């Protein structure tokens, strides 16, 4: 239904709960897999059918292929456009940490917002989405660090 680009809350009905967040871009809804787990979505009247998904990337798109291809430059600060449950969309600026894997380095933001913020877009200074928030690790005590998870066009 709602075709418009922008950030979206993904909601569920038992009452109602926000389980995650997503990005609509060029007619495709991008979110993280663990949020929807490949379940179809309702956009008002219409329905969004799953198009592509990958558990290892923890990503899933609807109505079309993955459209987000921008990446962190490994230097500049980014902004988490966090959409917390019951809260207005807000931009949190931060300098990304680094996930050092055997297959290369991944940008990582040391921000810890509620589970319903999963899938919130991470933006560069141009306003382009360089990744989604909600998949990472835990250091010490409650200190969650999320990778900047991006797919491929």
């Amino acid at each position: 239904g709602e075709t418009t680009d922008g950030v979206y809350r993904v909601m569920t009905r038992r009452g109602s709960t926000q389980v995650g967040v997503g990005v609509m871009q060029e007619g495709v809804f991008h979110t993280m897999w663990h949020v929807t787990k490949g379940a179809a979505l309702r956009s008002g009247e219409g329905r969004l059918d799953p198009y592509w998904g990958d558990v290892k990337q923890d990503l899933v798109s609807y109505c079309g292929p993955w459209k987000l291809d921008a990446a962190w430059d490994g230097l500049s600060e980014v902004q988490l456009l966090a959409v917390p449950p019951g809260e207005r969309a807000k931009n949190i600026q931060t300098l990304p940490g680094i996930f050092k894997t055997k297959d290369g380095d991944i940008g990582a933001v040391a921000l810890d917002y509620p589970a319903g913020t999963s899938g919130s877009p991470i933006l560069d200074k141009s306003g382009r989405v360089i990744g989604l928030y909600g998949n990472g690790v835990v250091i010490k005590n409650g200190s969650y660090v999320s990778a900047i998870t991006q797919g491929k066009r």
């Binding site: 290892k56 923890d58 300098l95």
Partner: protein, 38 residues
């Protein structure tokens, strides 16, 4: 059922709160998409 609601534009804001450090971690990604400290 699961449904979506628009929450705003995709926009960089100048009045952004700034927080968080920049940790460098050795991590591994397994088949299930789970990260783990190395």
């Amino acid at each position: 059922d699961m449904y979506i609601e628009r929450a705003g534009d995709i926009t960089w804001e100048k009045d952004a709160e700034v927080t968080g450090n920049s940790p460098r971690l050795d991590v591994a990604l397994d088949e299930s998409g789970d990260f783990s400290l190395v």
